Structure 1
Amino acid sequence: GVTVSDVCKTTYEEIKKDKKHRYVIFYIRDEKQIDVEVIGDRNAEYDSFLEDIQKGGPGECRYGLFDFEYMHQCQGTSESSKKQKLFLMSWCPDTAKVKKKMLYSSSFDALKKSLVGVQKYIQATDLSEASREAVEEKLR
């Protein structure tokens, strides 16, 4: 079905390997290809990511990649330390047209095969599933 532009992979790798950015928002351009829409600078925080993934309005869907920071403590140790983990999310609000929602759903696997290494996936249809609390519970 839908292809993936090489720019999705290079932007992704600049985060994983070089820590150059904090997040990316992707979109399907003209029902043909997944492209980059927004690149968050490394110092960005999560609220901005959430405001960017919804910036297309209630008729739109998006994908998002975020290098999420949280606190973790390994068994038997005496301290808790900050960690970070990449996750890839699909965002399809209920107000979007079924056709658009289905296309973003069917094309999600094409994007995941392109971003080798991501270990955590989330499919949200409302903000309750994309909150810091929902994500932190997922990344554990």
Structure 2
Amino acid sequence: ASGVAVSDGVIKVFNDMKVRKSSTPEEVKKRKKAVLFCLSEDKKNIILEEGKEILVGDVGQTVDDPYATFVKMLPDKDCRYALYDATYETKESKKEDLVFIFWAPESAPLKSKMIYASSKDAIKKKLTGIKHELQANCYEEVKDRCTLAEKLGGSAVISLEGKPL
């Protein structure tokens, strides 16, 4: 336990992103499909990465593949927390679940990896109600669209984000 606390701006983002309240169609487009969390400059709080977010409106018009675009947002030399709203489909149902991605590449400095890993359980206990978690330590572990499918359902998942696997 490093002691890093989750900021109120991250908890509010998670609450809005988790429960989908009835809203106007122009307000549905402002929902977040993916969002990145980082550490503050003093490394005391987990804050939001400004500009590192994917809106639902962008998906399908600007963002053709939400997962491919989200992966490119991950830094290549730094650790990051992520919240991806995966829309998949199994052989029996169509599901829409939140995924907690812990990005920690081997290329990241050792200082960042220790702080992010030690405080990972502290942030995830505040983000109550999330079941799927992806721990990625390499680009290949997160670039592949399949690796999410095994985490989501396994072999049951037949489609992901509207595209067959």
Fold-level similarity (TM above 0.5)? yes
Stretches (4+) displaced over 4 A: none
What 5-or-longer segments of structure 2 have no aligned partner? 21-27, 60-65, 154-165
TM-score (structure 2 length as normaliser): 0.74
2:133 paired residue among 121, 127, 135? 121
- Please point out which of 100, 104, 113 is paired with 2:116: 104
Corresponding residue number in structure 2 for 1:16: 18
Are the aligned partners of 1:9 and 1:115 in contact in 2 as well (CA < 8 Å)? yes
Structure-1-length-normalised TM-score:
0.86
**Cα shift at 1:128:** 2.3
- Which amino acid is 1:22 matched to? K
Count of residue pairs the alignment pairs up: 131
* Pairing 1:6–2:8 present: yes
Aligned to 2:91: 73
Alignment RMSD: 1.5
Percent of matched pairs sharing the same residue: 34
**Following the alignment from structure 2 to structure 1, what is the Cα–Cα distance between the partners of residues 70 and 17?**
15
Gaps of 5+ in 1: 75-80
What is the CA distance between 1:3 and its match in structure 2? 1.1
> Displacement, 1:39?
2.5
CA contact (8 A) 1:53 1:63 kept: no
